[PDB]
């Protein structure tokens, strides 16, 4: 039977970028014709493999990571990038083999008055490793004095909301992102393209 790419792309709600979701896709037949034949994708970049060549390759496991960021942050979902998202929320490896897909979701994820459900980590001490997920809400210590879970001077909540409003410019509007990672591990393959 087929790979459940629809449960990820057509999901009614996406996760915050800091707590990004991962769908592990194994033991199914995948068709990458429909994905590239769509016209609703504003971003569709592949690294290390052509999007038409995927119907000829087999991989051990395919990972579909999904989350929401704002328009101007989509450029950070690529190998070799820096910034709040790439450093503190979702980091792609320098030798990333896969595709990055994104589309404007201002009709779904923004509310008049603000949709404060989507968050991103603003304060973090060092950078994420590739494919790391930090879901900590510990108060961030910005000085020598420890915070003991109490907010104040030099003691800040590490997550910040986007407050997506539909009247925002596209750079501040929400974008749903799906990242397809093709793990060419060394084990009996399970996901082929057809």
């Amino acid at each position, epitope marked *: 039977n087929l790979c459940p790419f629809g449960e990820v792309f057509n999901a009614t709600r996406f996760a915050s970028v800091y707590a990004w979701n991962r769908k592990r896709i194994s033991n199914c037949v995948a068709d990458y014709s429909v994905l590239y034949n769509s016209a609703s994708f504003s971003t569709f970049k592949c690294y290390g493999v052509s999007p038409t060549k995927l119907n000829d390759l087999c991989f051990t496991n395919v990972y579909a990571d999904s989350f929401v960021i704002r328009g101007d942050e989509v450029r950070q979902i690529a190998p070799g990038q820096t910034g709040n998202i790439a450093d503190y929320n979702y980091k792609l490896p320098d030798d990333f083999t896969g595709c990055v897909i994104a589309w404007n979701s201002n009709n779904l994820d923004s509310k008049v008055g603000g949709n404060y459900n989507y968050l991103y980590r603003l304060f973090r001490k060092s950078n994420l490793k590739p494919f790391e997920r930090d879901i900590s809400t510990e108060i961030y210590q910005a*000085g020598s004095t420890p915070c003991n879970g109490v907010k104040g001077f030099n003691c800040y909540f590490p997550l*910040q909301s986007y407050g997506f409003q539909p*009247t*925002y410019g596209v750079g501040y509007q929400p974008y749903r992102v799906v990242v397809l990672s093709f793990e060419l591990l060394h084990a009996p393959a399970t996901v082929c393209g057809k």
Partner: antibody
Amino acid sequence: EVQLLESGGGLVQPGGSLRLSCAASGLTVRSNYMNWVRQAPGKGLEWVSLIYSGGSTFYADSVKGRFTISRHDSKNTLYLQMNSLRAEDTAVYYCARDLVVYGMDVWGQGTTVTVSS
Amino acid sequence: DIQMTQSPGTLSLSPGERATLSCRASQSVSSSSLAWYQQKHGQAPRLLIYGTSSRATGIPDRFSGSGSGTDFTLTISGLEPEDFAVYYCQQYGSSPLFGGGTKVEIKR
């Protein structure tokens, strides 16, 4: 007691180099977004350079390729290496701790850089 | 690119009057990314307001912020002699960006 004490400004000729220091107390440079903001005589504020606690650095187009922001965790000090200086780089330079959504709450007193032949 | 514009360049008021300082963005931005700064002559800037309307620590009640989208306002209720300075707004995209400034001077 929070304080950003800047030093290193002085007379430099165009094309020369100069390094500014920003000694902090009451906050950990290694743990913060830190900025350099300059103000030419008579004109407005201009953001120049930014460094993340995680180490990423970002620069204004007017200083890219010439300036380098950096720090020394032990000395709790922020630095700004300025190369290939130009007359338009003449300004008072401030360091500031940056909280992004919460603004730049702590500022230094400034240090003056004069670029002339 | 985004461009911030403050108006007027110079505001001429008497002590006790209400000052209204405008800051306009070239594209509609989140209210959390807009901050205000005061700079008195010969001094370093200080933070007045963050997140469009949140008053910073120690700032007097007479200062308040408002706006959204492309229009943002700094309001000073009951001007004080110490309040005649320059005021900069700042929009935070991927990096900070300051407006040109607005001078609040004494009317005569």
